[PDB]
Design a binder for this molecule. Sequence first.
Ligand SMILES: Cn1ncc2cc(Nc3nc(N4CCC(O)CC4)nc4c3C(=O)N=CC4)ccc21
Length: 266
Amino acid sequence: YLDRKLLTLEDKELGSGNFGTVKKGYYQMKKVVKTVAVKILKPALKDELLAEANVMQQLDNPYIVRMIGICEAESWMLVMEMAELGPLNKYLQQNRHVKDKNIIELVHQVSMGMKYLEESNFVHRDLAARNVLLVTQHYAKISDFGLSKALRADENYYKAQTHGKWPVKWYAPECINYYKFSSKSDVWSFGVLMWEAFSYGQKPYRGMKGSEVTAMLEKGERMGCPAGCPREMYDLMNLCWTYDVENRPGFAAVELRLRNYYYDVV
Ligand SMILES: Cn1ncc2cc(Nc3nc(N4CCC(O)CC4)nc4c3C(=O)N=CC4)ccc21
């Protein structure tokens, strides 16, 4: 595991995730230094960070943030690779010149990242543009597995005991209504992430309470098509927002439509 001495931290906080506060740092490997991002813990919580690390340790995919390791000194610390460009929603906010086909590339990468996660039977549970990190303008990685769960070999959903404070605007009806989280409910979140991407990092359901969003969806109402969003991408959003879980597509089908659409547009 990781040694505090070989870890240097800058003291400005880059932002906050589910169980901590992310800071830039430098970690000396054998010969070189790796620039890193370090989630630092604010009773239970230690277990939560450790659990997140336990999830990350089992994941190896090009489109998922790699964990370097864990560090236990002064605070409990989860050491990750640094995605220099930061979160997708902030980047697109500040980079309105980013081309529609650039955004397709990036959301397609998230869908590859998520297809892997679906094949691996892990549920993300907090998929949102804020937790997509940009290594480069054409390379996105999924992060923050603080809410993630390893599914049982006999089940395709995790059932939460209660509702703790949740990112309700990214949650499918069955998560809100029944606390049932599956890869299919990550697909719902992905659609909201797509809406975020093609709206250049604008928040979904602006000015509405979680309760008003739920009520809007149960009417069969959905968010509109963002300015300049290609119609095939907006169609996929609505598919992701299928109310019935069973009819909603899985990430294999979502990634396939993203892949064909992206490859079609050269
Ligand atoms: C310009 N900017 N603004 C924020 C920002 C953050 C990265 N920071 C990163 N930031 C976070 N968080 C802060 C922002 C929140 O939206 C999500 C939690 N997590 C990670 C990194 C990271 O590089 N690697 C693994 C995990 C790098 C650049 C950033």
